[model samples]
Target chain A: MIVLALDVYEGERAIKIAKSVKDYISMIKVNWPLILGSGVDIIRRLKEETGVEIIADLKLADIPNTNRLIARKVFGAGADYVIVHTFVGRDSVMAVKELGEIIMVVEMSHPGALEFINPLTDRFIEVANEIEPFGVIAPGTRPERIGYIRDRLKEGIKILAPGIGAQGGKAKDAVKAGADYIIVGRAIYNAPNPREAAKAIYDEIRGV
Target chain B: MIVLALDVYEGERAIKIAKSVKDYISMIKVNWPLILGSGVDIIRRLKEETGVEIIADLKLADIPNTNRLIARKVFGAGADYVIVHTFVGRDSVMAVKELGEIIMVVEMSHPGALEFINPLTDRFIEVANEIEPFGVIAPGTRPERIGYIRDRLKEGIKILAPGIGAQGGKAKDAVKAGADYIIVGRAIYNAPNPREAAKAIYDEIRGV
Candidate 1:
């Protein structure tokens, strides 16, 4: 499934972008930009208007009580799932899981991530298994990392990769490397025709 | 200094609590519950109502661009500083420092945090040094860790400790262990008189 990352800061722009790409994507990923800028109510609005699942890309990293409450708030505000950091330990990740589906960020996609996230993949995967997240995030730009996650995690754990297009990752390569969904943000939002760009990426992933 | 952690979820309650205790504290620490539950604008409102510095306890941990943008959004919304995770690496941590003061989360104030944050204290400190955040967070409950951090980090970076009062840490010990400020949340806001609770903690810290 293709997930449209509504990374825009404005609620209006996010709604517009979601409308443009909703048909081609299975879910809408709202990052801190939109969630912090627009407001949590925007999640319900996007879900109602676009008729797509909402993933709150919060990357939550805190204690169990704090993480649990924040996850409850996000889910209560209308998110189906939330992206969380594994470094917060098993309990913190588990706290959020009880509220909604969890996307464990085992590794990051940017150039600087390797300095920290890469070195801790093995331990992160161990925690990911113990917590049993619904999905795991591997850098879409790094197919090997996606494949590595796929190989390490239990079957049925969906892989969501995000560094596509603007971040120098291709949707096709990520899919071929075992990513179930390729998250594209600026690629679709920044395009002159967001609908066409989203459809093209969706079609390319389907073909792969 | 006493940093009143305005941990309440509702804007009205946060405003009330901030107004009640503003004179007793040096700054206000707004966490995810308050920021996400109320709104980022709560920062400006609290500042306007109480005339206190706002330290956003965001624990931001993402790629450089996203981290940079979110930090900008928070500061732009009127945060005097924002706490970030060092695990995101130097570049990601460095990206936000220019916008406002950065408080690097070297360790956490929860029981569960020891498992994840403590193991990487050495590397975390290395990055904290390179990033040179305005402050570093160490657990108030664990004064030894605060002492450990104070021993390693250079002279300028102030140590901010949380997990006080209700979380079972005392302001005097945290102060003695080198905490430049003690983040008192429920101990202050959940009290019968938040102002008195805040003043008591502040007086204890000063007396120490």
Candidate 2:
């Protein structure tokens, strides 16, 4: 099931937005700043309000000990999938894998994401297949790239494609690209009828 | 004054450590992992445990709106300082600064921190001074480098030095180099008597 990324203003509006589209979303991706402002209470609140898994998109990349501590915290918070950078270090990846049921980011949507990915994409694909995560999230990922990775890695890893909507990629295109889930933030959050947009995207990908 | 960072292992340990060293330390720095693992109840407990200010070292860096929400949350939690990264975008820095009464970091400590700092040292130093955080934290920072930064920054900009103790650097040297508060971890907690080690560092820096 694809998810919606609600990269919103961490205020009453964010709560409203999450509530507005909760039924349609399998999970909601919230960035660092929003989570911080809402406090931990917000986590419980968001979970209760949305009834959807919360993805903390902090994209942590740090020393093994630090990342391990962070993974423990994130998973403990009931986060279904916490994002970690592949470049953070092999030890960190292994440590986080052991600590939490985190979904890792093998790629990102922004421009430099590929610059970093080009060097390590194969290694990440190998690791992504090896780990027991929900899947990998990547920005700037294309429809063909998914097949390429799937063929190389034996087709088990799911893809969460961000960079859709305002960040530049289209949800329809991402669906065609073989992404298991597409993450849309501003595009859906800023829309006048976010729920309708979410439904549209959901239908587009669910193939119904 | 020297502050000590407490990596809260789990329930009670964070509160226990904070209480154990409250008198000997000036402030407490905590990461989100500890807070999430133990819950906000710990924040309330810590405040009662010690009059020393609490600093949340969540290192928030996200979109503008999200950043503001985090600042308010950290403040509401009774935090005197909230660590942030300048790289999130200038708006990110300004958004939290405008929130009022929160300290922000324009720099962070990590391995190869110097690699990022060495080239744009002057620029980040100026930006950090301009924002006028309650303090700036430099991780893995050298005492001599602190001296140079202290000279350039406004007279009142407090330097919160971390990566001391286990990361290697003396708390006394940090104070001597012009840090208003040196943040130490591991060295104290891993010691046979965490409180005694904390007191020794506090006293050593006070003497310096």
Tens digits of per-residue lDDT, candidate 1, A127-188, equal 88777888998878878888988999988889998889997999999999999998888899
Q: TM-scores, in order shown? A: 0.95, 0.71
Tens-place lDDT per residue, model 2, B1-208, is 7677788557587777778888888888877677666664466668778888888776654445666776776667677677765544456667777765445554445443333323455666777777777777654357887787788887787777786888788777877788887888888877889889988887787687
TM-score of chain B of each: 0.93, 0.90
Residue-level lDDT of model 2, residues A14-105, one tens digit each, is 88988888878888777665655565556666788878888877766555677777777666666777787654445666777787666776
The top-ranked prediction according to DockQ is 1
- Tell me the lDDT of model 1 at A44: 97
Give the true-contact fraction for every prediction, in order. 0.74, 0.17
- A27: Cα error in model 1, Å: 0.7
Kindly report which residue stretches of model 1 are placed more than 4 angstroms away from their true locations once superposed.
Answer: B166-169
> In candidate 2, which residue pairs clash?
A36-B70, A37-B69, A37-B70, A108-A139, A109-A139, A109-A140, A143-A177, B109-B139
